């Protein structure tokens, strides 16, 4: 993975030695070159993973997450260069260095062969994200939101540290390749009960679990646009990646430990979706929709069937692209009206027709329109949870009504109706903004032509 | 103070710690602690205000009580063993008295009650000596008597130090009291792993001394003793805010920093010995230390508190203070985790 | 540095270079007392280094190229706007007075640095011991608030305690009438707006507070405006003073070494001038502070430490 | 009153000083080169050649092989009368059982 780690590190002298008018264009160019090189991870086999070294490997789970991670950095640079145009030059370079450092932590989070190196990178991803939210967020509440984002994660994850070192002492290793072959059945006990909780609650916070999700509609709202893109597109998927690695070690106890959490997600995706019906803050509406979509990934991991893991990784990649595009659209209005209130600027299809087409496509992929990979992941999780219990389709289908209802109401409030009369600074869409929308949406629609690369280790 | 007298007194502080470290007789241990206290009292009274006299009086009383309990532990060892070798003690009463004496000399809770006062009463350099150099001699004596230290006593001292040093710094605005409660919590972390693996005790001591010396060197280089005067640093020297940011994130044990290195290794040595609840509650209580570190980073680096007009005059002068080893200690307190297996040099 | 503990160890004592002529003399008086020639006259009779009265741009004169900076970088205050609108809403009165106290503190540090490094006495004009006489004269006229007086007393309490008083204070007895006569003969259109009660408050805090508290810690010489015209009488009075008061008597090499270490570190001199008391007349918010600081970095010769500026022609930077 | 503060700056319009602005920068040459870099290295390079790369992957996770291999095995055992799939994955001769 060192062919991806060293170019990401060389982005640091690339961004600190550039000319002052050149520090966006060079980083965008070479991050796009790294994302072009990211397709060499697709050397995946039907039997074996692509095992690079003692430290790094990549199966078909980490590979779409790595391509999405290396693809999201140029899009974050495009999104975050307008509102940081008036910024000091050294602080602008520090912002770009925090995004580069976060990508550098993420690409060896997803490729960590050993689980405590996974933990170290997985918790190293806090510090650039925390600094970005609490330094380049706009409002007052970013300090409090950074505290919530920090201390839900660490309160969930410092038990995970003790649990991983306990597995290290018991099994002798935390190599995932060794633990594929040395995994022992985890019997029913209270010791193994709190073992399961210490392995799972950090990722339950990262997904987020409903009830633990309170950090998210602050940390995804009080952040700048690049922070919201990396949080909702990648950093919610560290939890699903970690669960799909760690439930190997937690059998057969998971088969009854999952029952409360599944309820917390199956009811949670009813509640949070319903919350999106009555949100005034558009960025908070996208945040509670993110909680609603990640509840399905929690259910699909906790029922641990093949169709569920395929649908869960498809839904994670699809939700990454979709929610990142939705945050970028909310920023495209917020750079014009300077308020995140959704009822403020209405009827924007009368003024921005192509941007309203981007809103339409993002909302149709949000409501899981076939044959988008949003619907592929949605539908496969629905199939596997129907095999889990035939009643859950009700809680699925009612969700699939409300998921439609907030996706179009967001379209109806922002883009339709009569426009707001007193707002007259609605500029035409810049080429940068439509470029960002197309670089979100065109990969998302091209993946419908060949979805087997985003279906994970057991396609 | 005369610089020659200052040099001779600081060499006498060092000589007291050395005589504790290198001697094989308990009387010379007690003599080294006496020499250390006797020489460090004028370092605390360097500026001659009533706060330094109060701090030196409180320091004298606690260290004198600890020295007398130390000598009673030594004398009881002489009762029950007839000899004087600095090794395990031959009576649990002498072990308890010596563990109490060294917990007083380290200022571990519930004998912590002098550490935030005395550190507030003295200058920043003498506070640096008190919070770094004055740990080395009692931790050496604890290193040599660990076959006789009671487990329950030293673990009670450890968890009580971690919890009290956690909750103490949450109410503070003075930087010296913040560093003092940080000291109490870190000494709890160092003695919680003493009977399990003393190499990780030495590791935590070295990483703590590096991070503490970095923070006191930054506080001296910016002449800052309160939070609210540290908040003017971005308008005076914007590099120092980045330095206190990375060093306060390192003292909280956030990976990939070096201060994640000890406590992780401490957990790594406490689960081998089948203690799971204890390092878990220790690591959960370390979030309090992290919280007031995050409070300081919000006040200093990640936001910009308003400054005054006279700061514009201080823009026209560069810092002529000798920032001794400050880039070295900044690097060694942040970027050291990829060199974590270097700890075998402490075995 | 140049001087430190090692130079004190290696034999540089300051009582070696401390002759009888090494006297710190501060010349005081009202706004047009005409003392400025007298001070210079004393400095050309005794071989003393004269320091002019510190305005806004004293720190600008000591640093960089020595030329005055624009007013947004230094001061953020105008003397002429205080002359025009003393009760102005923008808080320019106490902001000007606090910047003047900082400038006089820097000047007094330079005075003690010269006196302790060379042994040549220094003539000052209105040192930090005689700055509050303007402040009270503003406060008695309602030009500042009581919070400004409390802030000044805090900064003065933690700054003037670190230093020694002058050896000689020379005061010039001038009535308010002669002050206004010399103001009207001066021609400054702003300075003629000074009220008579302001000058009367200046003279009352002079004769009521300053000289009665400085007669114990040093030697006052109080001349009238016509006998201050003869410099040789004043210098002959100075040369026959029996110095018996003030803490200049009990100064060994150790205390004056500590004082010389203080006055050569300018950011420690100016440490507690900017204490974080949030007073609206001096508090600069974060956006203005960031903007003015980033503009100050872009001034020529001001981006780096002084010997490290390519743009003003510093060489051998890769070997420094 | 309140402290010495800069007033709220206006939001800038990149179309006033530059009606052909692409939204990247206020310098027009920098703006147009940022546009060309994003559109070439994003669309012409990563999207087009990336979809060409994904479209022509060498039998991604060997599914095609597994069809053709299956087309061997059925064709082997349609002839020999063997059942097309055994219910036992492993040979029962090489399995010891726990007796009772």
């Amino acid at each position: 993975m060192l062919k991806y780690i060293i170019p990401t590190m060389m982005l640091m002298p690339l961004t600190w030695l550039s000319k002052n008018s050149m520090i966006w264009i060079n980083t965008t160019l070479h991050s796009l070159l790294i994302s072009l090189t990211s397709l060499l991870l697709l050397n995946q086999f039907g039997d074996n993973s692509l095992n690079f070294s003692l430290t790094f490997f990549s199966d078909s789970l980490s590979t779409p997450l790595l391509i999405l991670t290396m693809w999201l950095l140029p899009l974050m640079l495009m999104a975050s260069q307008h509102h940081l145009s008036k910024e000091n030059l050294a602080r602008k370079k520090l912002f770009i260095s925090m995004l580069i450092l976060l990508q550098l932590f993420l690409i060896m989070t997803f490729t960590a062969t050993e689980l405590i190196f996974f933990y170290i990178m997985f918790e190293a991803t806090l510090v650039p994200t925390l600094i970005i939210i609490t330094r380049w967020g706009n409002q007052t509440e970013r300090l409090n939101a950074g505290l919530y984002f920090l201390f839900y994660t660490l309160a969930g994850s410092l038990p995970l540290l003790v649990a991983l070192i306990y597995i290290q002492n018991t099994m002798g290793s935390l190599n995932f390749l060794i633990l594929q072959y040395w995994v022992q059945p985890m019997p029913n006990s209270w010791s193994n009960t709190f073992m399961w909780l210490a392995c799972m609650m950090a990722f339950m916070v990262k997904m987020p679990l409903y009830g633990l999700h309170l950090w998210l509609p602050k940390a995804h709202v009080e952040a700048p646009i690049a922070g919201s893109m990396v949080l909702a597109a990648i950093l919610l998927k560290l939890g699903g990646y970690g669960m799909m690695r760690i439930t190997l070690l937690l059998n057969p106890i998971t088969d009854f430990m999952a029952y409360p959490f599944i309820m917390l997600s199956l009811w949670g995706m009813i509640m949070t979706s319903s919350i999106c019906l009555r949100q005034t803050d558009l960025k908070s509406l996208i945040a509670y929709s993110s909680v609603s979509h990640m509840a399905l990934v929690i259910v699909a991991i906790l029922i641990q069937t093949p169709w569920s893991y395929m649908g869960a990784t498809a839904l994670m990649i699809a939700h990454g692209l979709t929610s990142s595009m939705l945050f970028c659209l909310a920023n495209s209005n917020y750079e014009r009206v300077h308020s995140r209130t959704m009822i403020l600027a209405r009827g924007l299809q009368t003024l921005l027709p192509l941007m309203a087409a981007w809103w339409l496509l993002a909302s149709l992929t949000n409501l899981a329109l076939p044959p988008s990979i949003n619907l592929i992941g949605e539908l496969f999780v629905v199939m596997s949870t129907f095999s889990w219990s035939n009643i859950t389709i009700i809680l699925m289908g009612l969700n699939m009504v409300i998921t439609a209802l907030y996706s179009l109401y967001m379209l109806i409030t922002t883009q339709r109706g009569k426009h707001t009369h007193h707002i007259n600074n609605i500029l035409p869409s810049f080429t940068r903004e439509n470029a960002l929308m197309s670089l979100h949406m065109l990969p998302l629609l091209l993946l419908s032509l060949n979805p087997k690369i985003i279906l994970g280790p057991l396609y | 103070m005369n610089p020659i007298i200052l040099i001779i007194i600081l060499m006498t502080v060092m000589l007291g710690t050395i005589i504790v470290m290198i001697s094989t007789h308990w009387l010379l241990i007690w003599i080294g602690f006496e020499m250390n206290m006797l020489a460090i009292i004028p370092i605390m009274m360097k500026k001659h205000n009533p706060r330094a006299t109060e701090a030196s009086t409180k320091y004298f009383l606690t260290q004198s009580t600890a020295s007398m309990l130390l000598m009673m532990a030594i004398i009881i060892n002489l009762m029950f063993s007839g000899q004087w070798t600095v090794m395990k003690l031959f009576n649990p009463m002498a072990s308890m008295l010596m563990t109490m004496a060294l917990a007083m000399k380290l200022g571990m809770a519930p004998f912590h009650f002098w550490v935030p006062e005395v550190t507030q009463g003295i200058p920043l350099s003498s506070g640096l000596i008190l919070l770094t150099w004055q740990k080395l001699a009692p931790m050496s004596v604890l290193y040599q008597i660990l076959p006789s230290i009671n487990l329950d006593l030293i673990l009670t001292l450890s968890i009580l130090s971690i919890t009290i040093g956690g909750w103490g710094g949450l109410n503070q605005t003075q930087l010296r009291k913040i560093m003092a409660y940080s000291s109490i919590a870190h000494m709890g972390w160092m003695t919680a792993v003493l009977l399990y693996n003393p190499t990780m005790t030495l590791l935590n001591l070295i990483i703590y001394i590096i991070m503490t010396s970095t923070m006191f060197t930054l506080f001296m280089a910016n002449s800052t003793t309160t939070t609210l005067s540290l908040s003017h640093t971005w308008n005076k020297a914007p590099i120092m805010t980045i330095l206190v940011l990375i060093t306060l994130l390192s003292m909280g044990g956030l990976p990939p920093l070096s201060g994640f290195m000890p406590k992780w290794m401490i957990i790594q040595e406490m689960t081998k010995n089948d203690s799971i609840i204890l390092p878990t509650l220790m690591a959960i209580t370390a979030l309090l230390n992290l919280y007031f570190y995050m409070r300081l980073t919000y006040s200093t680096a990640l936001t910009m508190f308003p400054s005054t007009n006279n700061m514009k005059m201080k823009w026209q002068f560069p810092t002529t203070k000798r920032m001794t080893l400050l880039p070295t200690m900044t690097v060694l307190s942040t970027m050291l985790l990829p060199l974590t297996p270097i700890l075998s040099i402490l075995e | 540095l140049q001087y430190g503990p090692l130079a004190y160890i290696l034999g540089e004592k300051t009582t070696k270079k401390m002759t009888e002529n090494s006297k710190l003399i501060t010349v005081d008086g009202n706004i047009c007392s005409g003392k400025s020639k007298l001070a210079k006259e004393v400095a050309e009779k005794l071989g003393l280094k004269h320091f002019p009265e510190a305005g806004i741009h004293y720190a600008d004169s000591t640093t960089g190229d020595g030329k005055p900076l624009p007013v947004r970088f230094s001061g953020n205050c105008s003397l002429e706007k205080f002359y025009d609108d003393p009760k102005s809403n923008d808080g320019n009165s106490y902001r000007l007075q606090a910047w003047l106290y900082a400038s006089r503190l820097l000047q007094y540090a330079d005075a003690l640095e010269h006196l302790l490094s060379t042994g040549q006495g220094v003539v000052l004009e209105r040192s930090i011991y005689s700055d509050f006489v303007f402040l009270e004269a503003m406060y008695r006229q309602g030009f500042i608030r009581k919070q400004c007086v409390d802030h000044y007393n805090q900064v003065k309490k933690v700054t003037v305690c670190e230093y020694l008083p002058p050896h000689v204070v020379i005061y010039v007895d001038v009535p308010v009438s002669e002050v206004q006569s010399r103001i009207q003969k001066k021609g400054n259109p702003h300075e003629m707006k000074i009220t008579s009660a302001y000058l009367q408050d200046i003279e009352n805090v002079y004769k009521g507070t300053f000289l009665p508290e400085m007669s114990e810690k040093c030697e006052v010489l109080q001349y009238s405006a016509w006998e201050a015209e003869d410099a040789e009488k004043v210098v002959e009075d100075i040369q026959y003073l029996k110095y018996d008061k003030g803490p200049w008597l009990d100064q060994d090499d150790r205390k004056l070494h500590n004082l010389r270490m203080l006055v050569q570190d300018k950011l420690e001199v100016l440490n507690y001038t900017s204490i974080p008391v949030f007073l609206p007349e001096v508090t600069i918010g974060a956006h203005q502070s960031d903007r003015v600081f980033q503009e100050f970095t872009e001034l020529p010769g001001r981006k780096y430490r002084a010997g490290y500026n390519e743009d003003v022609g510093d060489k051998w930077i890769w070997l420094k | 009153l309140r402290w010495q503060e800069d007033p709220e700056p206006e939001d800038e319009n990149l179309y006033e000083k530059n009606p052909d602005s692409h939204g990247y920068d206020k310098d027009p040459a920098v703006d147009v080169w940022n546009m060309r870099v994003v559109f070439f290295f994003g669309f012409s390079i990563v999207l087009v050649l990336g979809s060409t790369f994904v479209a022509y992957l060498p039998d991604y996770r060997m599914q095609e092989w597994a069809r053709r291999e299956a087309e061997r095995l059925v064709k082997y055992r349609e002839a020999h009368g063997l059942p097309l799939m055994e219910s036992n994955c492993f040979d029962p001769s090489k399995i010891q059982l726990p007796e009772d």
Partner: peptide, 19 residues
């Protein structure tokens, strides 16, 4: 429109004898 930076009321919360 610009970034919120702390005011005097925010800053005085960190300037007491205790927090």
């Amino acid at each position: 429109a610009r970034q919120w930076q702390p005011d005097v009321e925010w800053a005085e919360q960190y300037g007491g004898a205790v927090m």
